[model samples]
Target: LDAKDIVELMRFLPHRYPFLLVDKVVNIQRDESAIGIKNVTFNEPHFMGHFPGRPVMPGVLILEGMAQTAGAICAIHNGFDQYAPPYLMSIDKARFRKPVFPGDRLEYHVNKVRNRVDLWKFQCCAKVENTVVAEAEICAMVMH
Candidate 1:
């Protein structure tokens, strides 16, 4: 069963503008999955050093986004998303396909694999225009 989304207002995590990757999340199902959305913009600083002539979103940043998506939802599910915060435990099986560009809207799809105690494992995909750009298996946890 799905619940009403938190919309675009809640400060669920302790991340700021440059570091905060997720803009909004929808289709949230407790203990199941959620889809996190982010609009890639040309104004990001990474494009300067990453590749001055040909800009592409960093793979590491993409993975970080996925982690943020999975962790934020898990925190929401367990009532720790607001203050306790979320952190990554592991990143595995990461793969990148299409390069993400400015104006591309990125969607991070996260499905829970399992959660033991406070740790959560998720299968994640990052997509743009319905094309899979990246995928990974990520493990994370919530803590105070």
Candidate 2:
């Protein structure tokens, strides 16, 4: 499948301008997987305080973005017409390999592991210029 622009991305999750990290999703495989992209800019709010002279996107937010991407994948498979906020249950094996700076385009990939009545689990990875930056095994429950 093709990518999702901001408008489409906005439809899946509740994050707004400052917190919405994924700019678009390029490839999607029904319930099986999805890939998302976020173009980091210097103007991003987090850069202002994350560090003074130098800026690095916080690791936690990066993982959150991946989780949001996973949420988008779930939304696609379940035909969720309206947004349903997901509560993160766990994040495991997450690693931050490099500092993410402005002008970096982050690519996120999430693969579904299991889907039950209310919970979803995924294996997630993120990269900058093909270098692995972070990854996690995450699970969440959708609150309708």
Candidate 3:
């Protein structure tokens, strides 16, 4: 399949519920890049405490979305279920340009920077309606 829904994503990732940032991934190019989609909603628990009258999607969560996108791409490239879980090691140069709110479709475009042994690096950005909202460079370690 060219696109991976939540069901197929579950096979590659162990995340669920409020913690699962990516709803689906498409345009996957193994060992290269992928696009991840996140359907932001007000019902998410973070919105309640993040603000009372105004709800903004947390920057950390946005970074998590990028990380998850990288993980999924890694899984698709290296073959999942056979290796240890993917872990976020670090985030570099993370910048938040615009606020993301409920009803915003957060699309993350993640590209592999490098991969060696158990560690991988990726450059990612989140966009809404062609506008860049956030971007970061993430490092991940695929434990095995």
Candidate 4:
């Protein structure tokens, strides 16, 4: 399933408004992995005062988007209707190789690293125009 619009996206993700970094999810494979996309734009609220004229997408937000993708992965494995949110525990080995600008479409791909005891890890990366903008190791926990 794919979150092509904000409404549809909200059904699977708990994030709301400006904090929701993911724009759309392209594909989802249960208990395996998923791919999501975020269209970065100058209109984003964070760019307003992040640097005034520079308007750089914050590295932490980029990682958050990837982590959100991982969250979606956990949501799916947890049956997509779990009564709790997938809380991000940590991000390790995160790297930023390029600068993301308005009109850049961030492709976030995540793979299941491990899942046991309601704890999960995903190897995720974000790409812009085929260039890796960010990559990280994300861990999360689903709580009831």
The per-model lDDT (C-alpha) reads 0.82, 0.85, 0.87, 0.81
Q: What is candidate 4's lDDT per residue for 43-86, written digit by digit as tens?
A: 98999988799888899998899888777766766666336767
Q: Against the hidden reference, what TM-scores do the models get?
A: 0.89, 0.94, 0.94, 0.90
Candidate 2 lDDT, 12-63, residue by residue in tens: 7787867788888878888788898888888888888888779888999899
Q: Put down candidate 3 lDDT per residue, 13-116, tens digits, no spaces.
A: 77777788999999988767889999999999999999988999999999999898888878767776423688888999999999999999999998889977
- Candidate 3 stretches with Cα past 4 Å from truth are none
Error of 4 at 131 (Å): 1.1
Question: TM-score for model 4?
Answer: 0.90
Model 2 misplaced regions, further than 4 Å: none
Mark the regions of model 1 whose C-alpha exceeds 4 Å error after superposition: 1-10
Q: What is the C-alpha RMSD of each candidate to the true structure, in Å?
A: 2.2, 1.2, 1.5, 1.8
What lDDT, from 0 to 1, does candidate 1 have?
0.82
lDDT score, candidate 4, position 25: 73
